[model samples]
Target chain A: GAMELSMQGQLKLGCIPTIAPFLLCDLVQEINQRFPQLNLLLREDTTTNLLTALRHGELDVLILALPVEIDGMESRVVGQDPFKMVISRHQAGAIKVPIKYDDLPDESVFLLEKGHCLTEHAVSACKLTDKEKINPFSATSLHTLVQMVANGLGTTFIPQMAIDHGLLDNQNLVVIEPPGQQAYRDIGLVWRPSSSRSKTFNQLAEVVSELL
Target chain B: GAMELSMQGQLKLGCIPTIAPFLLCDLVQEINQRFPQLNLLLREDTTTNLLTALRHGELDVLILALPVEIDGMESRVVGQDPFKMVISRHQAGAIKVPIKYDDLPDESVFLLEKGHCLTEHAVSACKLTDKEKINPFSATSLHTLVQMVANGLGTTFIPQMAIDHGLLDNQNLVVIEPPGQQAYRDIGLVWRPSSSRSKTFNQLAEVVSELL
Candidate 1:
């Protein structure tokens, strides 16, 4: 009957563990409300692995940070996120405007490790050459890094969407914008070039794009 | 002041998004209850990113799946997970006791794409090669793979913990333990060699280890 006619079923999505797991619950709730036949199951992976999974046909679709250059895949921009400057409230007056990457000296700066797209963006924007001397104090997550900066351990950069999501509500923290670079990354839905799920993912992508 | 003491923090933990995000609210509640002064924050990354994050000092601890080999990082086993075969109820009677990997042939099999340790473990245990040809249909998560199998798309391998967590309950499905290879993966807490937060992380690790 309806089950036979309905194309609705399970969808397996590989995602960056940071956002996907938190958001998937709500995303699935919304999807269910709209398309009762569709069910979304999330597979949390690192961004690099998510891309690899998508490439190997391990994932039907992936939700991740954009400006990523992966061959044999098509990506649709679903969301846009801007960069943010996280610093100690005590250092608020040190910079007149939003802090720029060039302004950051050899001081302690917390960052994600090498594989993260955010870290790469930060390095490129800061024009960091000596990878060895970048001397980053790594913090596992945006929240941890923010708290670290608030505690005066070091400063770090975060995505604007995260800030908007209340990651910067700490009293000891000061939020600034990245200067000049217009630092932003497109968050998108990506899939293999010829996956059958492309059409459905494209529709989902359009819905997400509209929300963004 | 207590603020300064809190500012020094205790341990910073990086967690894979899959388990971390779902358990975050509960983990934070437990931590706040036990150690009020400990400033514990959860960082979310993909499994692969978490390893590198730990290596780079971004995180002091990580909770993720096992069989990951990283240089300069130490892991303490926290739990063990067994693999199970999931099939539709209609096929339940047909499956004999202790299904083996070799038994999967002639039946459609759904598998997680590459980078998923589960996929590798399942394929290797089954002694199947040319997976792209053997199991062409792929899924990104255990939940969806289960549903797909239930819908008659194919049978698949799932973790016992996932099943115990009620991933497929009250559904028309059968759980079978395969013969020959006792497939399992160790879940562990990992950390860098030189992290200052080692003491707190080790304590937490001990708590997790005791749970196993």
Candidate 2:
């Protein structure tokens, strides 16, 4: 029985819901083939709540953005991606390959309400001040944020995966990179000190990086 | 730059919308008071999509049902709850407290469709095979499910929060505890391990547990 159930074989993961559009199905198939009986349970919420869970041992590990400063935790770098600026088609004509935050004056910036790490990364990279923000309605979905930007409300930033997943496929979006700040998020696997499954986790991280 | 751009101090939360009445509002207040500049974004979707977003780094923290397993993720227990059996008030004579699957007759069990954790657990607890199930429509709110049960169509399951939120009041229903397998779920906060916000997160969990 021990051979089958590797005490650490079961995984309880806490995740932010953004990249799941691409990874969810692939992971299921991978696990089904590699660790047939291995159980994978996923819970999604805000990054803050997930980090809290990891701190208390509620989740076995996390596949999240890196550069996080947690005590007594370990992380394996899985992937890294640059942040992109999504702009209105009308606003796109003046822009070039890469976008600059400080250059976009007289333009409003729409943002997700709060409690989202995405928002923080996006906002900080934009170089916009509190007095110049233009999020009339707080948004939760990137879809909504895109739509707002397309409607000429303002421009918004999206993670690289958003483009990969075609979050802007049908939209009137002009995608540009944040070149000034070299904005990016380092994706990685975060774990607790108590877990005895690093060998398996590291292997899993390799698979994740290969996919990226 | 940080002081001028506290504009994007925010978070996005993707949830299943199961426990808004019980705990969501409190968390909202807590964040508002504690992190005045931190904005909070909230979204509700199926558990599957929510976890996908979490994996992709869309949310900052999560409060959801436990017993989930995923690699690179961790969790912390906030509370535990028992599943309650719901039946038509007019047909109440057939069951007693602490229901057993064998006791559930050949009657129909209304399911909440594929992705919902509650629907899956409820369906399994009733011990109905997929063929015997007759879920003609997919329902979201507990209110809709209760209405269906009251219409004398089929039996269903409700979380304890439903009763506390008066979801059963004025409805034609009789509720019972699940026995044998002792149906219940653990409520908790989950996260990635790289986060250094554990002190704040633990305090938040304490508040959530106190209410439960």
Candidate 3:
């Protein structure tokens, strides 16, 4: 089936870095193994740019998380990556009880730089803009954000995919899930509505679903 | 003393990430506190590129680590940051006994992308080339490498400055130092040998030395 799909030629795939770890973790290898002929031209970037590329016919599909507010696009919920807090291990004792985004003061909360949907999601989901600092360092990546938090510079939010992928394994950082319904970023595959590769996109989304 | 040193006006400073955490941790505030008139234009990048900029006279000084082999460049030892291993806490049991670069099998060792002196230093310090994976992921930054290693994908090396400043504070990753005399990257201030800012540079070095 995959070989038949590969007959259509190489597929152009785009993904945001925040979602890259989990999207490519096992799915890419499995795709390559199952369909050796399928050439995946993987492009890594922010969701906005990826969608722009998709609109212009540069990408066949995008592996991205939701809060997706684009017109003329179709998407499938392949996975749900819940959000969690990453704080310095040294500071973990401060919150003996449960904590949420609103629990931390705005002055001590850091944010990811622009272009990342994760940052925007956190800002909107938690009302981060209301309490955030004026001239923050603007972490370039989740990894950098974790480092800043770990160094006691401030605190930050990370999605489940990153936490599941071991984003917190190396440092002295602690992961704390917010109580209540819990916050999560829904992951999915997006493509132009008029694309002729629904079958291929659906099949690929299947592989991604299995991996997630 | 700092106000007197600020007589030279503003200065441009460049540094590799490995040295930035420790150098900027408290020293930046202290600089601002002690020398209000001295405006610092801080730049963070790879050592080679920073040095290239320095060679072109774009940067006045670079806070970097050793194994620096450049002609017409003069340096003074400012600090020494040892090396440490960042491995998934989930997989750290394998290293229950003592571990060093020699202890790693090389099959799963992750490293920073090309151009970073930290990667180069690790490769040379441990002969990582002979045992490295043929088609490694070539992580773009220490943060990404840490994430990969934390997720049980592989193991990585980090500098003492990063560790000392709590780079590992938020993850499930474990920090293990190799036994005996710990491996360290020597740091210093580098600049053109013929630069006209020797008086100011020497004064800056004194401040850096005091901070470290």
Candidate 4:
């Protein structure tokens, strides 16, 4: 017999907007297949909102980019999601592999709106400076961000997961690997430390890790 | 040398969330390639907000589903965007072609969060009733809505443009044609009646029609 946590009824699952579409479509099905008794209630929002809901007891667990350390929260890393540069083929024509942050034409770099952690992660991971070079006209979603790149408007960082999921398909764009060892975000599951569902969360984290 | 409107400088182009990713990537590139002197500004928002912005002069033109009747607005049809039923292969295995609205299991149907015109169009186009059967756990975007369907949570309507753009790629789902002649929405360009940019808007609408 299995020694899994005896979880039942509805459990609210929160996810960051960036990862929800690229990952959760598979994660949710895998979770249901593994834990037939668990009922999922889902929400896709930014890291800030998901964290706020997590703290307020509205969300049972979250899947997001990590290293989040809130007062009563605990988390487990599932995988390392690498960030790749998506640039228009016209602009990327001269680019070389193992792209350094400085190799990019900073002025044409587009990013998501102010709140997406992906923007923060890309900026910090790639050591991007001279903030003015960041495009003032930002996109509200990765889809739009990639669309901008496809239109030859600029370049942006997209996670490997999204790229692998065919986000750049048929678009006249190039995906270049970022420089350095720290060019990735940690994908993880987060939950309140005091929740009785810690074991369940741990099991989910394991499942995701294996899935990755 | 030309009878074209002496349009120069920036043009604020507003598009609804549903169409921006699928169409604007191509549209923006095409517009720029054909009109080198015209600088482009972009915004992706809901129809209600975009219309309000247009009325306030914050936007010059909009791309959205049409038949809108605001007093001070004018629009031109660009194309017909059919709504396809995205269903889990598990649930869709037995469904027939030319799917009737009654053929859907309404209780399992998931939809966008309220206020999205796509949901309104879907409900009205398909003649879906029994509002209570609509899932209370709604998605914030089409990506999430389709994720829900891919997870076998339920079915939802996706515009054909998005499906054609690979929104359904790699998903364990099926797309069915809706019943009757009224299974689609008209995609068009809208602008203020008194704006000086009517010629420009008309040209762009012609471009989109040809693209479709």
Candidate 5:
């Protein structure tokens, strides 16, 4: 049995761009430590593309923001990735923590391009309307978005997981908690329900859950 | 004549993903500060896609690693982006500055995914060979690659611009200069040869040249 399900083969894991940088290193390291013989291969892309690859059996599993349309797929929640409002320290002068919805200035907001789920998640969580949704430049990565916010161009939402992983270090930026309401993106591992690697996927989810 | 060459219109600047996060914010802020009316529209994509977009008149110019095959375009060098070896502090093992070529371990050397110019730049700059580059996983971003290096998964080369932007901050990693020979990527601004806004692009190049 160990030979058949011995975790000796390669496991191709796909992750969305937003979640990959903050989580994959630790996930891979932990997996390698636990199962020395197992090999982990990683691919990072947008959710739609990663899902397509998964359906085609190119990727064995995926780590992505949850509440996605995963028809014909099974997913297990690992943790909640809360978001924080990031603003330039100059713009946030004397501003207190837990910035209220009203305290948010009527300034230009920056978000990722149309395909990213973070943009959608941010718009819904922040309850942003058309007037307050004027983003002139859509960034392709959170690193670039932080650069924009750091330069006082605009404000944006960043995941707590990224912050915990030191994404904001030395950027001269301030973070404010969600205004009154809890705002979070559910992170999960998704795979085909009919796959025989359900045991491996379950163990992987448990490891990620522990890391979170 | 003033109306025709006026700097009052939008300048659509496309940049490669590797350079966007490290450079764009400051460039945008400086341009806005110097020329109050010139709006900067930005796009982040690969060289091929950006070039296609530029040729289609969808973008005005691009900031990318120089010496690329741009036959119908003209380019001006802004600065040289030097490469440095980044390894986990734990694995660095009392290594000194300016790591030598022979000193580099026979460990897995990670790199970005294909289609990114950074991969080619790194391969050529570092004089890396097949045996030295046994990267099993191809990362999509430098942020993710840094995470992998920080977790002691493997070592990789990073740009000095990124390092100066604090990409290594809060991560326990070591940066060593390229072995003996000077290794770098030429950063430049490229545009179609017949573009009438050469004056504007020239000034933009000056600003970036000064930044570096």
Candidate 6:
């Protein structure tokens, strides 16, 4: 019988710090329990960074948000998270039901700057004629966006995980279910096709897929 | 005088680690010396990570090899580096002069996998029509590619920096100029337009432009 080599070396896992950090802690805990010989080394990065690391062989595997397209790589969806609207309490009197994209006050909408997939989704969902004229006030992070909305600055879309993470818990913030848009980003694991750890990664992917 | 809060805590820098990590250390030291109050934190990620960080607003700026077209972001050339043909020493007598893209033996051509900017540039330079027929042996790093070439496994293209950094210092490795196509990648800094660091970033861009 062939015995597996000891997984004593550090397995560098690159992932989007925004989500991977949270998910990886659980992953590490589980993997450590099953294979005590394996030591998982976490390397937090943005989605793009994780992809690049995977490409360069600097990372063994990456957890990233999708709608990302990478050539010559394998990806498996691990979860689905929907986007919700964050509005100021002051404007709560203006809308009765969950706000739809069409109902959004054209002038009051804030957006993350261009290059964000969410921004593009927002533009397409709202059927805006000109995304350039949206008059977006850029918020650097989900927390910042929520804070801005809390201060009655402007309204923006936020992911459900952000809400679950308590980013929209402010009393002055209103979370609206935006209609007509199944706005969600898929979270997944990505790895190079030629990686030696492909089998292990696939196993990890299956576990996440099942859990999600 | 109205004192602006220290940008040291505000700005974040991201860059690819393909080039020597020591270069980043040198760059950080130089940047700090120039702007003592502006704290520059260097995050060494793969090009993919840097781009993702830029998109996510987790990073204020990125320095990486380009020809990438990231939507809604502005890119400026900060430097240029050339690539050279790396061949085995045993085959040195087989080809006397510099090899042209079309003149290379069609046997085994080692290439960086897809999603790599260098891989795209290499294929484009070679005017390769049938990418599927290229029969490439993929390598994650230039160091590995050079070593493979040195071992008489295959020939590959390597950036000049990699050669200069001693990745191809072996006697079995031969450097040849690839004619017709300039094997060069422009290293650039990219960022979203709406970042508060935009003005200062431009100033840094100007410094890079002048230096380059």
lDDT of each: 0.62, 0.62, 0.68, 0.78, 0.79, 0.60
- Give the worst 10-residue stretch by lDDT in candidate 6 chain A: A17-26
lDDT of 6 at A103: 60
Worst window of 10 by summed lDDT in candidate 5 chain A: A99-108
Order the candidate numbers by lDDT, best to worst: 5, 4, 3, 2, 1, 6
Clash pairs of candidate 5?
A: none
Give the per-residue lDDT of model 3 (tens digit) for B1-212: 36763434667777776666455645554554466456455566677888898999888998887877667898898776778777766678876646654555656677766677888776665445555542255565565456556545557778876666555654567887644463666778899988888888888888887876
Give me the displacement of residue B75 in model 5, in angstroms. 1.1
Q: After superposition, how far is residue B119 of candidate 2 from its true place, in Å?
A: 5.6
Looking at candidate 3 chain A, the ten consecutive residues that score lowest on lDDT are A126-135
Q: Give the TM-scores of the predictions, in the order they appear.
A: 0.53, 0.49, 0.55, 0.87, 0.80, 0.46
Q: Name model 5 segments beyond 4 Å from true.
A: A1-10, A26-39, A89-107, A129-132, A150-153, A168-174, A177-180, B1-10, B25-39, B88-107, B129-137, B148-154, B168-180
Best-to-worst TM-score order? 4, 5, 3, 1, 2, 6
DockQ of 4: 0.42
Computed on C-alphas against the true complex, the DockQ of each candidate is 0.11, 0.04, 0.07, 0.42, 0.31, 0.02
Candidate 2 residue B172 C-alpha distance from true site, Å: 42
Q: Tell me the tens digit of each residue's lDDT in model 1 across A113-190.
A: 666677876656544454443434455555455655654544666776555544455335777766546566678888
Give me the runs in candidate 3 sitting further than 4 Å from their true place.
A1-212, B1-8, B100-106, B127-129, B132-135, B179-182
Residue A66 error, candidate 5, Å: 0.9
RMSD of each: 9.3, 16.7, 9.8, 4.5, 5.4, 15.6
Winner by TM-score? 4
**How big a share of the true inter-chain contacts is recovered in candidate 3?**
0.00
Docking class of 2: incorrect
lDDT digits (tens) for residues B26-65 of candidate 6: 3433444465455443455566767887899878887777
| Second chain alone, TM-score for each candidate | 0.78, 0.77, 0.86, 0.89, 0.90, 0.79
| A74-173 per-residue lDDT for model 2 (tens digits) | 8888777678888766567765555544555553666776766777766665554554545555666555556555544567778887677555654556
